[model samples]
Target chain A: MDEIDLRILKILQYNAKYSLDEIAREIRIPKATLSYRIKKLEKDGVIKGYYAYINPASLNLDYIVITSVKAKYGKNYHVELGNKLAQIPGVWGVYFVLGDNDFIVMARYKTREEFMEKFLERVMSIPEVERTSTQVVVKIIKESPNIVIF
Target chain B: MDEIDLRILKILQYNAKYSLDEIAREIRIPKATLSYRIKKLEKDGVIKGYYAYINPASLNLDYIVITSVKAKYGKNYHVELGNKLAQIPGVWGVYFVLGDNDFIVMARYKTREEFMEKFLERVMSIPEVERTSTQVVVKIIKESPNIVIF
Candidate 1:
């Protein structure tokens, strides 16, 4: 990946619907070259897939929380727990981490009461889970999948 | 914002490029209704925009971390600090939160050393930033923008 490649990816990250010509023009690269590079990126799995960004607030499922879990020690316990957490509904993402906590999860709920009664209980009931902490998002200033490539 | 609306949004959330006919076929809705609903979703700000999911791992830029930050207490410190945090390079998102920490940020870097030198330093330098803590992601078991709609 070079500067041009990164720029191409950045453009797509911002808006994947951009036509090949539009992106090529913005990057100052020839259309053929740009198309070839994007195809290469896709084939290589760098550009995984495409999706529309849905604002959960609009769906009335706006209570976003980040939960950290500490699991009991065991062989591959983190992986096992991570998989389980992923299977649970409302979990947008799960990460096995190298930190005080074994797992980190981002979950969405319609209300704080629902989060406490439903999601919290679900996490606590996992046999591998020993302890958990949570942080409720008050406001999301900027939310995007685009990484800093420049 | 009914079950049908959620289902419609769900399909677009997975792949925005799906044609109206394709989505209508799947959801068993008429093409005209599907198009009208999607347009309403966009106008209502439910469907924010479309973007390609670029896997940082594929670009060798997969050092992801979740950092919690506490800004110095003030009347509008969070609003000010949240915007500043969003401007920092490598930050995928910043959420002002009502929790143990005032804000939670998800950032990505190419390496731990770069994270410490560039990203950490930048966060600490912010005038309102009192403290920050981070958990390095060992593995992302599941990461998606899709929300649970059903």
Candidate 2:
């Protein structure tokens, strides 16, 4: 919204543990003002929520895939199918894209067998889903939870 | 490390603002014990860090792309190229993957001009980058910050 807002957002986005005093010190704003800004950001829906960034490898859920999904056309099929895609156990990221594919689905599995049975089969069973093309990931180089902000 | 750990993680993973009191009540653990387990989890690196999830749309950065990147081979080329890709202005997610392509890169751009100037141009200038195929996103059905945990 403003320079101050950007600064506050950046500070909070990187580390969720920023105390009011520390954030005020870094942003050169009053501690109370810092709290108000954050509250306003939450009310405006700019700050969606807070989260703990867990490592998939630590949980042995690191086997990743980025799959392009295609589905039959229907009324709000994007909504209908997208919900179905997101509900699948491993599916975490789903996007309705304008391309040869209808949606882009990103998911994780603990192993190949889990990927096949828990992922592919469940998706294929969804009648709305017509086809899917998957790219299996070998390693994660970087995965920042925060998207770039202006 | 037990039933209680999974329950605690699930609660915290869904909402970062969960107080220790609530977590203890939910997990049926003493507040002091809950605090100790959390510290241990952090020390062991299972809990990487906390983050504020800001909506890209609110920042006018909803334009998205999922791209496959190819590179010339080299010693630790994956490391070299993956870091290069991650440092690009708009790149937020970078992963090494099998198949015809070597890497998968996901990013968001505020607009087409910005995408070309900030994203594609920068990536194209990288000497290691051979080619890139991108799928432009139309709508984000869902993009969860937390991955599915086992």
TM-score of chain A of 2: 0.90
* Model 1 stretches astray by more than 4 angstroms: A30-33, A148-150, B148-150
* Regions more than 4 Å wrong, model 2: A74-79, B74-78
Clash counts per candidate, in order, are 0, 0
Task: Pull out the clashing pairs in model 2.
Answer: none
Q: On residues A17-115, what C-alpha lDDT tens digit does candidate 2 reach at each position?
A: 988998899889899999999999999999988888776776788578888889888777758988888888888898887656688888998899999
- Over B1-150, each residue of candidate 1 has an lDDT whose tens digit, in order, gives 788888887787777878889989999989999999988988999887778878787677768888888888879887788888888788878888765857888888889888888789888778887888898888888877455563
TM-scores for every predicted model: 0.90, 0.93
The Cα local distance difference test for each model comes to 0.81, 0.82
